[PDB]
Amino acid sequence: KQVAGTMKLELAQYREVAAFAQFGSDLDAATQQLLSRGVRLTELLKQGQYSPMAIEEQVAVIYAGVRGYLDKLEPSKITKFENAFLSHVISQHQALLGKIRTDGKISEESDAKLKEIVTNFLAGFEA
Amino acid sequence: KQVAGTMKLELAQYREVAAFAQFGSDLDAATQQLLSRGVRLTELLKQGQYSPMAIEEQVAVIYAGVRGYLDKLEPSKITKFENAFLSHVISQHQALLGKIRTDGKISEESDAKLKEIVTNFLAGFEA
Amino acid sequence: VAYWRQAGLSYIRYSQICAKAVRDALKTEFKANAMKTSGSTIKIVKV
Amino acid sequence: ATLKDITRRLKSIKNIQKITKSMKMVAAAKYARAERELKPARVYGVGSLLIIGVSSDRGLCGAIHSSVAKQMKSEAANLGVGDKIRSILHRTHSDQFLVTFKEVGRRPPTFGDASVIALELSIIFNRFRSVISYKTIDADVLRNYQEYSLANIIYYSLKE
Amino acid sequence: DPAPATTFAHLDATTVLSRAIAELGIYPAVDPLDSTSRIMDPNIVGSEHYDVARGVQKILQDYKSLQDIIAILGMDELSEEDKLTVSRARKIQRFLSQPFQVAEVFTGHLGKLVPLKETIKGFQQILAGEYDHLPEQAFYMVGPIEEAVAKADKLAE
Amino acid sequence: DPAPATTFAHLDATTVLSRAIAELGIYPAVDPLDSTSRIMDPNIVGSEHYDVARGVQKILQDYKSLQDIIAILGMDELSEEDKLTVSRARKIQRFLSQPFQVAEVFTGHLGKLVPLKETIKGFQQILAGEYDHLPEQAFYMVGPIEEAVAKADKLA
Amino acid sequence: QMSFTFASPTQVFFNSANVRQVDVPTQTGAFGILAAHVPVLRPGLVVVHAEDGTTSKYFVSSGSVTVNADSSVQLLAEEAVTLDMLDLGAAKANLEKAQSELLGAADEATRAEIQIRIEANEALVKAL
Ligand SMILES: [Cl-]
Ligand code: NA
């Protein structure tokens, strides 16, 4: 509910605005941000089959997109980011994923841990 | 019958050209005359509900469009222009409407008399 | 070097002022060219 | 699929057929006065004889804008006049700009347009062929001969 | 369809919803160029109300015709008068949207009730061009016109 | 239509032909975006196969979405990014064509039977952009990707 | 003889025509370009001595003039006009407005813009 609270409506407006400005005209910073955000949220919601994800692992990967860490990266590398990010949190941070599974929420402690993890992870990917 | 035949022809000249009214800009004076005049005449066809007019009141309003006294007026302000103009010519110039109904046309005397009432009201209204 | 230079102005500026002086001094009839030509249609943009 | 959908498509494309018909008519009008001012400026330009690209603001004219944009990145990778020059070629070479220009192509391009370009301190342009086709001594005396002839080469690329 | 077609005549006011509008996130997905009422008259609801309601319908109806033309031929072919009415129309579409209290579980936004006085003033100002400087998405999914101004500053960072 | 519509369910692979594709000269006139198989699976066919298949269907579907704009104005009015996908997609569409042994009388060309290794490899090279410089009709009615290079050299 | 050319952005006057001599102004003096001559303009008169009798008179504001090894010339002018289409009364009034705006303005860049216009208009009244 936290990470995908206003995601359903925002993605509907993204497809409206993206389809509207197909022509290569100049636009303000607020609408190009919506396009920049909406493209990379769509790449997160891509998913293969015969491997369904647990609620906490879904919450982890949606965090990166919705809180804005993916915005500067290229659209084509978002699926690569997600796989590397998901396998990393499965490896080391089982306490954090476990704490979201036990509680059923993102605490301000867990928010601060994810904030530290994704920012340091992003700097590695961008280089 | 005098003003209707003239108006009908000019609207036909407009309706062909009107599809590229907005998409034109660098248009010649032939089509710009038809596009300007046609938008003016269309706005004179607009009318309020529950206020049906006498024939002498209609022909005066159409005549203003046909002889082209409203050609430089802003197209958006024609419906409001007409509503005040109608109240003015009914209130003050009650004898003038008697001439059009008696004579069965807009005579040379009425032409000149109505010409003064439009051009002065036009400069006063648009300010 | 030059009175028009030193301050900073180049020959293309010298040419634009001289050419405008000729078009400004005409006998009406031939200004149809001078109104069409010599326009400032270009807009300056920079980042 | 639906009748309501197909009636909407006919409604729009009917207007576009008339608008496209109008725009070739306006293009033919500008083509007339562009051709009649060509041969006076052509002998002037040929008699006269940093990457600059020349086209216009207005689109809907085939690959006039993209042709000059393709040869700029060619000259840039080895080693702009028009709003469509920016929209296409800018974000890729955003740190390689001196100046960019707007409001061109609509009106006839004058000599005063070439001066304003030169004042702000090879050249790429589309040379005309036919209705269908196109194709992409003192020390200080030479100083002023350079700057005026520079405005003539920029003016030659504008009229072509 | 015979069922809804027959129902119209039995009604004093009609609120027609569209899948086309809901598809774009615009909730409530009311068609502004299809919903009607008997009381929409300058003698009943006043001329200031009436003239704004028709102004909203005009700018939306004029925009509806353009949409299909400017999808192919591009935005830059429009007049400066047209692309003014295009930008205003798109903001007006978004300011017609509203987060309901009963729909809080779908939107993710707090429910808002907008009084009639602040509704009319909101669409008055957008028609006149008082928020042409402000961006597009600030009008989407907010209660009164004041929230658009506040949300516009939030979208700066 | 109820007859074909019901038949889909009773099948493991569907080769859907097209008149639109047939009129443009592409034979066999298969729709690459309307034909499916239940073994199109990276576990069955291998991950290299699957990626090259879905990559071809992506660039074909991207080209299909532009067809309203290309029909009116043309290929020249698109952006440089959009024209590059169109040029590859059209080269793919023609490389999807092939001369059949049973249809030698109709075509004129000698019949070809391309092995699975060179089928993947050919479309894999085209997606990467190793033949953006080559023309379109060089890929039309050829067996392996080698014949597309050989046909292009004779033209120049 | 000489392959003489003389044109402007708007109009063209001559194009490889057989002319005897063409006097043209410059920044330093005024060269008379005869057919025999060795390998920057100023506001002044361009006198064109034709092959037979008559001598027409033009005016040129600014630009450049070229003299090649072979007998060929191309005089380039931004605004070239004849004495038939030049007003004297306005040229005096323009010279007053320029000298007016000189005695007042103090900016170092602007005085150049005024003093060029004074020179250009003073060259017109010399002819007119
Ligand atoms: Cl009211
Ligand atoms: Na095949």
Chain E closest CA to B79's CA: distance in Å? 12
HSE, side-chain direction, 13 A CA sphere, residue E104: 6
DSSP letters along D54-106, please? B--S---STTHHHHHHHHHHHHHHH--BSHHHHHHSSSTTTTS-S-EEES-SS
Question: In sequence order, what are the beta bridge partners of D101?
Answer: C44, D81
Cα gap G35→F66, rounded to integer Å: 64
Cross-chain residue pair A26–D88, CB shorter than 8 Å: no
Q: Find where tokens 């064109």 sit.
A: G48
The secondary structure element, H or E, covering residue G63 is strand G63-64
Q: What residues contact G117, with CB distance under 8 A and at least 6 apart?
A: C17, C18, C20, C21, G94, G98
Q: Are D100 and D74 in contact (CB under 8 A)?
A: no
How many other C-beta atoms lie within 10 A of the C-beta of residue D145?
20
- Encoding tokens for residue G71? 């007998």
Q: What is the CATH number of the domain that holds G69?
A: 2.60.15.10
Report resolution (Å) to 1 decimal: 3.1
Q: Which residues of G touch D149 (CB under 8 A)?
A: 64, 76
Report whether D68 contacts D53 (CB < 8 A): yes
Residue E8: other Cβ atoms inside 10 A: 10
- Residue carrying structure tokens 């060089």: F138
CB-nearest to A23 from E23, E75, E136 is E75
Q: What's the CATH number where C41 sits?
A: 1.10.1620.20
Rounded distance, CA E25 to CA E23, Å?
Answer: 6
Phi, psi at residue F13, to the nearest 5°? -140, 140
SS3 of chain G: helix, strand, coil, percent, to 5: 30, 30, 40
Rounded CA Rg of chain B: 15
Start-to-end Cα distance in chain D: 47
How far is it, in rounded angstroms, from Cα A99 to Cα A107?
9
Domain that holds residue A52: 1-126
* Whole-Å CA distances, E147 to A94, E112, G19: 42, 11, 79
Phi-psi region at F69: left, alpha or beta (left = phi > 0; alpha = psi -120 to 50): alpha
Closest CA of chain C from D109, distance in Å: 8
d(CA A2, CA F92): 45
Suggest the residue from B17, B22, B23, B28 to mutate for an interface test with chain D (most D CBs closer than 10 A). Answer: B23
Distance of alpha carbon E41 from alpha carbon E54, whole angstroms: 11
Task: Give every CB contact of residue D84 below 8 A, 6+ residues apart in sequence.
Answer: D55, D56, D57, D58, D59, D65
Strands E13-14 and E36-37: antiparallel
Distance CA(D141)–CA(G40), nearest Å, equals 6
- Do G5 and G59 lie in one domain? The reply is yes
Structure tokens at D66: 């993209």
Could you give the angle at which helices B78-91 and B94-103 cross, rounded to 10 degrees?
90
Q: Which residue range(s) make up the domain with G107? A: 87-128
For G18, the 3-state DSSP assignment is strand
Q: Quick one: tokens of A55?
A: 């609620």
SS3 G15: strand
Cβ neighbours of E79 in B, within 8 Å: 22, 25
F78: Cβ contacts below 8 Å, ≥ 6 apart: F66, F69, F70, F86
Q: What residue type is G59 in one-letter code?
A: F
Show the domain range for C24.
1-47
C-alpha–C-alpha distance, residues G23 and G21, integer Å: 7
Numbers of helices and strands, H then E, in chain E:
8, 2
Q: Is the peptide bond before F4 cis (omega within 30 degrees of 0)?
A: no
Domain spanning D26-160: CATH superfamily? ATP synthase, F1 complex, gamma subunit (3.40.1380.10)
G21-31 b/e (C-beta count within 10 Å ≥ 16 → b)? bbbbbeeeeee
Of the candidates D8, D11, D16, the beta carbon closest to that of E73 is on D16
How buried is B121 (Cβ within 10 angstroms: 0-12 exposed, 13-18 middle, 19+ buried)?
middle
Angle at A16 between CA A12 and CA A20, to 5 degrees: 165
DSSP sequence for E85-150: HHHHHHHHHHHH----STTHHHH-S------HHHHHHHHHHHHHTTTSSS-STTSTT-SSHHHHHH
The CA distance from E115 to G72, in Å, is 84
**Same domain assignment for residues G3 and G47:** yes
Q: Where are the alpha helices (DSSP H) in chain G?
A: 88-102, 108-127
Helices D111-119, C11-24: axis angle to 10 degrees equals 150
Asked whether G60 and G82 are in contact (CB, 8 A), the reply is no
List C-alpha distances in Å: B117 to B60, B61, B68, B86: 11, 12, 14, 11
Residue to mutate among A17, A22, A23, with most E CBs inside 10 A, is: A23
Residue where a domain terminates, one of G86, G101, G116? G86
What are the φ and ψ backbone dihedral angles of F135, each rounded to 5 degrees? -75, 175
Record the tokens describing residue E144, joined without a space: 């009164």
Q: After which residues is chain C broken (C to N over 2.5 A)?
A: none
State how many domains chain C has: 1
Q: How many CB atoms lie within 10 A of CB E137?
A: 22
As a whole number of angstroms, the distance between CA A23 and CA F82 comes to 11
How far are the Cα atoms of A75, E24, F89, F118, F151 from residue F128, in angstroms, in the given order?
A: 18, 35, 12, 15, 20
The C-alpha angle A121, A123, A124, rounded to 5 degrees, equals: 65
At B71 the three-state DSSP class reads: coil
Query: How is residue A6 annotated by DSSP?
Result: S
**Burial code of F5-17, b = ≥16 C-beta within 10 A, e = fewer?**
eeeeeeeeeeeee
Half-sphere exposure (Cβ direction) of B114: Cα atoms closer than 13 Å? 30
For the CA atoms of chain D, what is the radius of gyration?
20
The Cα B86–Cα D105 span in angstroms is: 47
Residue E58 and residue E49: Cα distance in Å, rounded?
Answer: 14
A22 in a labelled binding site: no
Do G42 and G102 fall into the same domain? no
Residue F84 Cα to ligand 2 middle (Å): 23
* Long-range contacts from D4-8, C-beta under 8 angstroms, 24+ separation: D8/E68
**Secondary structure string (H, E, C) spanning chain F:** CHHHHHHHHHCCEECCECHHHHHCCCCCCECCCCCEECCCCHHHHCHHHHHHHHHHHHHHHHHHHCHHHHHHCCHHHCCHHHHHHHHHHHHHHHHCCCCCCCCHHHHCCCCCCCCHHHHHHHHHHHHHCCCCCCCCCCCCCCCCHHHHHHHHHHHC
Q: Give Cβ neighbours of residue F123 (< 8 Å, ≥ 6 apart).
A: F52, F55, F56, F92, F95
Q: Tokens standing for D116?
A: 């304003």
Contacts of D88 in chain A (CB under 8 A): 24
Helix ranges, B18-107 (H): 29-45, 55-66, 78-91, 94-103
Residue E77 tokens, joined: 């072919």
CB B63 within 8 A of CB B28: no
CATH number for A4: 1.20.150.20
Task: Take residue A54 and report the two structure tokens written for it.
Answer: 């647990």
Encode burial over D82-102: b for 16+ CB neighbours within 10 A, e otherwise: bbbbbbbbeeeeeeeeebbbe
For G5, nearest residue in chain D (alpha carbons): D47
Interface test with A, best of E136, E141, E157 (most A CBs within 10 A): E136
Residue F44's identity, in one-letter code, is I
How close, in Å, is residue E93 to chain A by CA atoms?
Answer: 12
B-contacting chains (≥3 CB pairs under 8 Å): D, E
Q: Which of G50, G41, G65, G47 is nearest to G18 (CA)?
A: G50
Alpha-carbon distances of E119 from E59, E92, E126, rounded to whole Å? 17, 12, 11
- Please indicate, yes or no, whether residues G72 and G121 belong to a single structural domain of this protein: no
Is A47 a known ligand-binding residue? yes
In contact, D80 and D57? CB cutoff 8 Å: no
What total of structural domains would you count in chain B? 1
Residues in Cβ contact with A27 at an 8 Å cutoff, skipping those fewer than 6 apart: A21
CA distance B33 to B45: 19
Concatenated DSSP letters of C12-40? HHHHHHHHHHHHHSS-STTHHHHHHSS--
Quote the CA–CA distance of D151 and D48 in Å, as a whole number.
10
In angstroms, the Cα distances linking G127 to E20, G44, G61, G106 are 75, 8, 12, 31
Distance CA G53, CA A24 (A): 63
Residue E137 to residue A34, Cβ atoms within 8 A = yes
Measure B23 CA to nearest chain E CA, in Å. Answer: 7
Alpha-carbon span D112 to D99, nearest angstrom: 17
- For residue F144, whether the previous peptide bond is cis, meaning omega lies within 30 degrees of 0, is no
